[PDB]
Amino acid sequence: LYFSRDAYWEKLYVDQAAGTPLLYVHALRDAPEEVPSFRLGQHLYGTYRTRLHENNWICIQEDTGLLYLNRSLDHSSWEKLSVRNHGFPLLTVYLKVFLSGECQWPGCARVYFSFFNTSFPACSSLKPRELCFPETRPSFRIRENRPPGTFHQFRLLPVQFLCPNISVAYRLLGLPFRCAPDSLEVSTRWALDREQREKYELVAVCTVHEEVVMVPFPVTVYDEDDSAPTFPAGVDTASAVVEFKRKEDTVVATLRVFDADVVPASGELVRRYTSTLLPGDTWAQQTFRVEHWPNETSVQANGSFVRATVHDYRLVLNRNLSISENRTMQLAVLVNDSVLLLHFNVSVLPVSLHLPSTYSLSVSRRARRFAQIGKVCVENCQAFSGINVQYKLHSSCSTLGVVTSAEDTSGILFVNDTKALRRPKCAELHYMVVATDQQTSRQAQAQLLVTVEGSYVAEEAGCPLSCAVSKRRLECEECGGLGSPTGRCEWRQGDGKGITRNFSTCSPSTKTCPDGHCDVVETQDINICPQDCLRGSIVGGHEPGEPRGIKAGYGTCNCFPEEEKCFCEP
Amino acid sequence: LYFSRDAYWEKLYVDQAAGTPLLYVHALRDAPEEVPSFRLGQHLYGTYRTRLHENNWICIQEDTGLLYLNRSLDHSSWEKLSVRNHGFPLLTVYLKVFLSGECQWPGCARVYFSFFNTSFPACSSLKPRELCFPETRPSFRIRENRPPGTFHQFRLLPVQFLCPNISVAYRLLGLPFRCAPDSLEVSTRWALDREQREKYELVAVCTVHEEVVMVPFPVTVYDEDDSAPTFPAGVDTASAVVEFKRKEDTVVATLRVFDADVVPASGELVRRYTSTLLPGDTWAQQTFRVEHWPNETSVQANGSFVRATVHDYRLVLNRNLSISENRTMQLAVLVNDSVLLLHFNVSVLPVSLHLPSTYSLSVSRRARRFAQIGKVCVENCQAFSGINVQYKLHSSCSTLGVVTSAEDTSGILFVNDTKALRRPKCAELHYMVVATDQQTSRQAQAQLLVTVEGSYVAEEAGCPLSCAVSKRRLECEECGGLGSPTGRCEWRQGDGKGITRNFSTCSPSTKTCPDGHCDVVETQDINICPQDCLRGSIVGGHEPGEPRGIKAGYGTCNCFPEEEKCFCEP
Amino acid sequence: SDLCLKFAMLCTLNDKCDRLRKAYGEACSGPHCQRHVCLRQLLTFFEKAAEPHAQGLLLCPCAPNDRGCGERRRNTIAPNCALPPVAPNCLELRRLCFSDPLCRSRLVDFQTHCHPMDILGTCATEQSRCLRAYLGLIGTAMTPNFVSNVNTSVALSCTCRGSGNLQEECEMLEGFFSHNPCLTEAIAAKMRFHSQLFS
Amino acid sequence: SDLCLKFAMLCTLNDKCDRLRKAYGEACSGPHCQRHVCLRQLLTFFEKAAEPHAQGLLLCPCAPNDRGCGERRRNTIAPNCALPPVAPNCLELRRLCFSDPLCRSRLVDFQTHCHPMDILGTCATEQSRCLRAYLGLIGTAMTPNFVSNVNTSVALSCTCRGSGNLQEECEMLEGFFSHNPCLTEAIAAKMRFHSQLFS
Amino acid sequence: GCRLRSQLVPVRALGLGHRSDELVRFRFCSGSCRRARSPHDLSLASLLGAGALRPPPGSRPVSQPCCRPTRYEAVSFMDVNSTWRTVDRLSATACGCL
Amino acid sequence: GCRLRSQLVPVRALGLGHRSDELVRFRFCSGSCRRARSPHDLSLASLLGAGALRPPPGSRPVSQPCCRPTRYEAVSFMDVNSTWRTVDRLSATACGCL
Ligand SMILES: *[C@@H]1O[C@H](CO)[C@@H](O)[C@H](O)[C@H]1NC(C)=O
Ligand SMILES: *[C@@H]1O[C@H](CO)[C@@H](O)[C@H](O)[C@H]1NC(C)=O
Ligand SMILES: *[C@@H]1O[C@H](CO)[C@@H](O)[C@H](O)[C@H]1NC(C)=O
Ligand SMILES: *[C@@H]1O[C@H](CO)[C@@H](O)[C@H](O)[C@H]1NC(C)=O
Ligand SMILES: *[C@@H]1O[C@H](CO)[C@@H](O)[C@H](O)[C@H]1NC(C)=O
Ligand SMILES: *[C@@H]1O[C@H](CO)[C@@H](O)[C@H](O)[C@H]1NC(C)=O
Ligand SMILES: *[C@@H]1O[C@H](CO)[C@@H](O)[C@H](O)[C@H]1NC(C)=O
Ligand SMILES: *[C@@H]1O[C@H](CO)[C@@H](O)[C@H](O)[C@H]1NC(C)=O
Ligand SMILES: *[C@@H]1O[C@H](CO)[C@@H](O)[C@H](O)[C@H]1NC(C)=O
Ligand SMILES: *[C@@H]1O[C@H](CO)[C@@H](O)[C@H](O)[C@H]1NC(C)=O
Ligand SMILES: *[C@@H]1O[C@H](CO)[C@@H](O)[C@H](O)[C@H]1NC(C)=O
Ligand SMILES: *[C@@H]1O[C@H](CO)[C@@H](O)[C@H](O)[C@H]1NC(C)=O
Ligand SMILES: *[C@@H]1O[C@H](CO)[C@@H](O)[C@H](O)[C@H]1NC(C)=O
Ligand SMILES: *[C@@H]1O[C@H](CO)[C@@H](O)[C@H](O)[C@H]1NC(C)=O
Ligand SMILES: [Ca+2]
Ligand SMILES: [Ca+2]
Ligand SMILES: [Ca+2]
Ligand SMILES: [Ca+2]
Ligand SMILES: [Ca+2]
Ligand SMILES: [Ca+2]
Ligand SMILES: [Ca+2]
Ligand SMILES: [Ca+2]
């Protein structure tokens, strides 16, 4: 059982007669056995749902579901009620109609009554627009796969009870909906399926006396599970071989499922569409979870748009895979619908840790601490995701030093001492560069021939420790900072477009410091790259770096790292 | 036994002969039995009293007290000693001569020796000024009341031992000192008394070959108790009647004593000259101590000045005498001399506590709080010292209020409320002024007829609480302060003589506030008299009030009492 | 200078209104913005201020072609921090309103006083107590905002995509914002007064 | 401007000397003055300073009629706070010197190096180490000062009135200050150098 | 007296790069502080009265204590892209003698 | 920079009534304090750049923090009667940005 609507509307007037028919109600069937019973409420609710006075006036007939005035209305009753209205002009009371607290469909249906201070007027003041249909248009509600029944009736009952001398006719326009002759109930021919069509917006023809009036007529077909899951037209298996990524959680391989139902809604979709991992080795549990989340799409059937659910199924890892794993499997998953079979092929490969045979690098002979010379990298640099290849620099004069930046798993080598650089007998050295792993002991080494080469000019005594304490261009390349590669600094200057990310400063490494990353070499000291590694106040119109630093700043930005301040100012 | 001097001087030279007579010593007698014995020391002291080397060279004859060179001198000995001198050119060693640690008279006498790098010269280089007497003149030392003896000898012994061919004669000028013929010892005729003469400065005549040479010759006669205390020529008793003072310690009555001795010196005068209070009633002990302190004066005897001691004896109280005591006594004191009789008459009087019959005072009808109108005083105001006569103001409308200032024991009356002053029915009141005592219950009362009289003008709203917040003259008499007698204030202005005690300010009471006393009425509030009652900093060239306040200040001084500051500035 | 700036400066020139507008301009700024402090200072603004000051600040007139007068009006309640980045299901957004007893009180008054009574535009009680129930919804979880920048169509930031079978219970709840005759004629009556007031 | 101001400003113009002169000008000022803090900052001044700076500041020449050049010199060691108000017995003043082991060390050097050796004026060791032993007596208990303001006669502030029988033991101890040939010719040799130096 | 002020300023007129069109109220400090005066202040105001000092290279030393804020407040607005920009600590709330 | 100074002044030239003849060394504070600058200071130095404020009646508000002493020392001398006069807290010993 369910009502064909949820809200019913009716008008009451002063001094109308007893036994006057107000309206019918309608209730369709879920089954070939259900007969509707109708009971009223007892207390008229009002605006902000508060009981005003007990229904002493409206009675019901359970057989056809007829609402009719038993006792009648007067101004003493509509001052008895309108004072109880908490101070509002009364234009809406209502009751509940149950058939099997708070009124909600498909149990209840709330029936409004809009009262007016006049009596029921004469027939001459009835325009045919208020003679056919009520003002608030209905909206109907039919579940699919149901016994066909009767869901609407046309006639305005107090109208023909009080103006019977005007003939009014009603009709409907391969459609399942028909209007019976000489009995104005509307009925359904065959049981509907939503998946063919889901919205029927019909037009009902009314003719008074003489005026022809038509109104919209919405019917929304509801839904059930009348559909089983299906491959998207013969794509039965996708596969993917783990080669390089090996991180914690990564989308590896993916398939799709096309259900045509909507009914397993967002609250309880997780109970029904469940991804049963078919078992195998416990390495599959240790390393795989089959993640799943749905999304609704639309598809055409016979000129309309019926919607459906798409269930994506993705292999996602669980842990850092080690390097030396070399296996293959068949990962099967059952999919439930309340039943489909999917699987994956997964192979895991070994990876070697080879490095180039000979590294070759010059060093500027006047260089300072923490200067980046050149990058050292395992042969496949930016493709790995979850491998710790830490680099250590073993010699066979300590001048250089390697610390691997964790973002790229590349080792950047930097100069750690300056006094041990200018020595004449150590003008050529041997740094066996060693690239070790951490989840396996598998390391590597490679050969280097360093040539420390350049001039030598001693520095000025009026130099601060940082390049970025400077303000203008000429005080940048005459004075040395801390992380400088050739003893000088370098001035970068941008545009005059306001607060821009491309601003002006004096930097040691114009490609490494004002870059967006506070590198490990950059975060070594407070003085090397302060305008991208500081934790301080930036006086002036700025916009902060998102971990730290200066993302953008109005004009020139000069920073005091010993006092933890920046000024951004033109 | 005592030496006639304390220091002896002699010169040594290179390579002088053995057995050469250096000098005699002299020692007078305390008694008819004492014969002097003379021993030398063993070790030559030097500059800063340190032993240089043992006396291997100088021996003594005990009979006449003769000092003579046993072994003789050479440059090896005077480099043996002068290196030991801690680096000084050696011109003074010395020895001790005892007759009965550190050399002090009348036990010891230290004998100097001034050595020179030459040998003893020939007789031609001896001027007769160094042939008669040594360079350092003697200073002699004779106790009185002694057996007369021999205290000096003239001849320079190595001179006549080494230049015997020159005749030298010596003589002296009713005097007790005589020089014997053909034996050049000087002797005393009769026993001396200091109280006749105390200094004999004689002249000794020397004649060489031919030159006459004379030198001074001091003799200081010492002292004993040969004198008894004596009234200062028949003033046997002073007396004094306690009438009004009655404080803790006050000089009441005084006498003098004239001793002619000096010997009971400042260290042990308190043991000997002691004031024995002869007894009587214990009220005399409870209320009197006989204080005593000496002072030395000078008096003429036969043309000289002999000094003597004057012993003053003063009655001094001990406690606050009550009023109602009425007694008389005879306070006797024995005085010891190691014995005189003194006394005092002391009477103690009653004092009544009468007040004037009718007090009469006007009150300005616009007056403020804490204004002084008129003084209330016990009939003898400034003569009492130790009496607490507190005043309380009993009525028969609370407007006035009396608080006795403790300095004068006078009650100053002040206005405590302003709202209760302008009332029409209390335009004449009755304040029975009550003057109570505290060490006796004896109180008093007196009658008052107050006339509250004046205009009435309400005040300005732009007035601070104090008159002395103002800066110039016109902002003084247009605006009211706190302790004002007539609602206005009054400007006092002094000179332009720098930091003066007479400076410029705006004061309520020009005779009570910038006066030097923070009165009780003035110390009632912080705002009444701040420039004489504050405890704060005085910014500017000032000079502080000695309990508190501003004693003097450069120019104008305006004080903020709510912030505790003054500015002194022109 | 348009009208949505003239009615903003009249809240600036007040002492009582600028002190409140500064309180949510600060909590709704920058990329590191915090949402539940940004919303709490909006209830305080549209609650503890004078009604002619709030109603002029939010609902302000414009032309259809006047781009910088509707683009500001969309961004007055700071939607980049107040409205969530992902659009949730529009029945789920009502659930969070029903849980907190302030949003429930602010929502029931709007379902009371602005219910679509007649399809011509006639409201239930008054077209003056409609906006008082409307503006009480701004600091709550169901914050409405102007969708476009050329017209005064106003809706929630929600979608009825993953609705399941409650499509009409979601379509009507969105049609209570974008198909209200009552609320649209109320906001139109207020904008036709604001184009009379200081125009 | 006289000479006792010229040799005062040469201690002012130094960094090392004005910092020390400010240390006893502050502790020896005002009517509420405190004596044993006033004296302790005088030993530090005549000890921890350069000898040409101290000897020029204290011993300074003048004329007999030049009143404002001797009146300052009497008041350089601040006698109203340093010297006691009542004049004690002059053997008692030596007792307090013998009790403290700094004044005893400063007094024994003066009885060493400035003893009247000859009545013409010849000193014992040097007429240079006489003033070094002399100026060490200023911050002690036996502080000498210039008695008059017209001449350079210097004595203690003491009297031999209540001496008892030790009159010559007190008269010689005062004659070691007012009848010294050695000390007087030493101070005269220093003043005849100060009237050669910057005159 | 050294007390609090308030005023209206454009936000382009602040010189911090924020381009906008609005007005903001702005509280600054002003006044005199003759009641927090020191002995050194009278001294320096008289040594700079007869010109007894050579003034040093750089600035002039000020005699009286300057009237400075003690606390600050943030200022919020909208830019030309209609985005809320805040600048912390731009307007005072209480003044004092320092 | 905001650092300590020192100088020589007569004591009649101090204006505190002490008549004398001497010279005293005198330490004052001077310099600039551009490193203790605030957002309000740049704001006020730009609002007083285009004249965007009406300056209030009384003084001008200063933009930068003023360079002031932190500690003081006493100054001692002798007067014309040759009596030691002290004036407490007349010369600085350390400066700072306030
Ligand atoms: C309806 O009215 C009749 C009389 O007209 C009365 O007898 C009957 O009880 C009423 N029924 C109800 C349910 O009120
Ligand atoms: C899966 O489908 C079967 C088939 O009836 C049902 O018994 C089971 O409960 C379903 N499981 C879930 C989690 O929906
Ligand atoms: C669901 O699909 C629509 C269109 O196909 C897309 O806009 C939306 O982002 C999808 N949702 C998710 C969570 O991917
Ligand atoms: C995998 O490696 C990443 C690299 O940072 C690490 O953060 C993560 O915790 C690792 N996973 C596990 C399960 O340890
Ligand atoms: C997955 O592996 C099985 C095992 O032999 C193989 O038959 C199948 O072809 C593989 N899948 C694909 C898509 O090749
Ligand atoms: C080189 O860098 C390392 C980093 O671990 C540091 O421990 C070492 O002190 C540095 N060398 C010198 C000489 O400081
Ligand atoms: C004195 O000298 C004689 C020899 O000349 C010697 O025998 C005697 O012991 C000496 N006496 C002393 C006390 O040295
Ligand atoms: C007082 O003189 C007598 C007389 O010889 C003596 O016995 C007594 O000790 C003396 N007392 C004092 C305190 O001197
Ligand atoms: C002692 O007498 C002399 C002169 O008679 C006087 O100057 C001195 O002050 C007196 N001493 C005391 C303590 O009264
Ligand atoms: C005597 O009176 C004075 C008055 O102040 C008081 O100070 C003193 O203590 C009193 N004497 C005694 C012994 O109580
Ligand atoms: C002291 O009192 C006695 C007692 O009568 C009397 O003889 C004597 O004259 C009084 N002293 C004086 C100086 O009058
Ligand atoms: C009057 O002065 C007395 C002083 O003891 C004080 O207690 C009282 O409060 C004053 N009167 C009023 C009305 O304040
Ligand atoms: C307002 O504009 C939006 C988008 O520009 C549009 O979806 C909506 O239909 C418009 N309103 C009307 C009433 O057309
Ligand atoms: C120095 O003057 C004082 C007092 O003016 C005087 O007593 C002293 O004798 C004078 N000195 C000489 C050597 O006359
Ligand atoms: Ca179906
Ligand atoms: Ca299904
Ligand atoms: Ca279905
Ligand atoms: Ca960088
Ligand atoms: Ca005698
Ligand atoms: Ca005697
Ligand atoms: Ca005698
Ligand atoms: Ca006074």
Residue numbers in the entry:
A (entry chain E), B (entry chain F): 29 to 128, 135 to 207, 211 to 246, 251 to 379, 388 to 445, 449 to 622
C (entry chain C), D (entry chain D): 159 to 357
E (entry chain A), F (entry chain B): 122 to 219
Paper text:
Signaling through RET plays essential regulatory roles in the development of the nervous system and kidney. Glia cell line-derived growth factor (GDNF), Neurturin (NRTN), Artemin (ARTN) and Persephin are four ligands that induce dimerization of RET through assembling 2:2:2 ternary complexes with RET and the co-receptors GDNF receptor-α family proteins (GFRα1–4). Here, we report the cryo-EM structures of four extracellular 2:2:2 ligand/co-receptor/RET complexes, including GDF15/GFRAL/RET, GDNF/GFRα1/RET, NRTN/GFRα2/RET and ARTN/GFRα3/RET, at near-atomic resolution. The structures show that the extracellular region of RET adopts a ‘C-clamp’ shape, which is stabilized by extensive inter-domain interactions as well as binding of calcium ion at multiple sites.
The same procedure was used for the structure determination of the 2:2:2 NRTN/GFRα2/RET and ARTN/GFRα3/RET complexes, leading to reconstructions to 3.4 Å and 3.5 Å resolution, respectively. The segments in GFRα1, GFRα2 and GFRα3 corresponding to the helix-loop-helix-loop motif in GFRAL are much shorter and adopt extended loop conformations. As a result, interfaces I in GFRα1/RET, GFRα2/RET and GFRα3/RET are much smaller (buried surface areas less than 700 Å2) and likely weaker than that in GFRAL/RET (buried surface area ~ 1500 Å2). Interfaces II of GFRα1, GFRα2 and GFRα3 with RET (buried surface areas ~ 730–1010 Å2) however are more extensive than that in GFRAL/RET (buried surface areas ~ 680 Å2), which may partially compensate for their weaker interfaces I. The D1 domain of the co-receptors is invisible in the 3D reconstructions of GDF15/GFRAL/RET, GDNF/GFRα1/RET, and ARTN/GFRα3/RET, suggesting that it is not involved in the binding to either RET or the ligands in these three complexes. However, there are large differences in the angle between the two wings of the batwing-shaped complexes, which mainly originate from the different conformations of the ligand dimers and their different interfaces with the co-receptors. This angle in the GDF15/GFRAL/RET complex (~60°) is much more acute than that in the complexes of GDNF/GFRα1/RET (130°), NRTN/GFRα2/RET (105°) and ARTN/GFRα3/RET (108°). Surprisingly, some 2D class averages of the NRTN/GFRα2/RET and ARTN/GFRα3/RET complexes appear to be larger than the 2:2:2 complexes. We performed the same image processing procedure for the dataset of the ARTN/GFRα3/RET complex, but the 3D reconstruction failed due to inadequate number of particles.
